[PDB]
């Protein structure tokens, strides 16, 4: 029980670093955001 609990706790502790450290970790959600922004900016720029 104690070893399993400690392994879980250390693994959960490393998630903060893994997300914050590797830049392209949230890349799928950032991709959604960027696609919307890019499409609207393209629409605006097409008015010229």
């Amino acid at each position: 029980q104690k070893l399993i609990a400690n392994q879980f706790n250390s693994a959960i502790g490393k998630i903060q670093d893994s997300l914050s450290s590797t830049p392209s970790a949230l890349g799928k959600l950032q991709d959604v955001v960027n696609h919307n922004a890019q499409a609207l900016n393209t629409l605006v720029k097409q008015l010229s």
Partner: protein, 48 residues
């Protein structure tokens, strides 16, 4: 010159409709109009 109120305006033939406000744009003596990314005049130097 009416400011801060939606008006039809005509500046040296540049016709439009909107609210005119005092600007902080740093124009240069050879510039009469300022343009946005859509190629729409969004800042104008008053002729007089």
């Amino acid at each position: 010159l009416v400011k801060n109120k939606c008006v039809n305006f005509n500046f040296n033939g540049l016709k439009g409709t909107g609210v005119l406000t005092e600007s902080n744009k740093k124009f240069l003596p050879f510039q009469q109009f300022g343009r946005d990314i859509a190629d729409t005049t969004d800042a104008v130097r008053d002729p007089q």
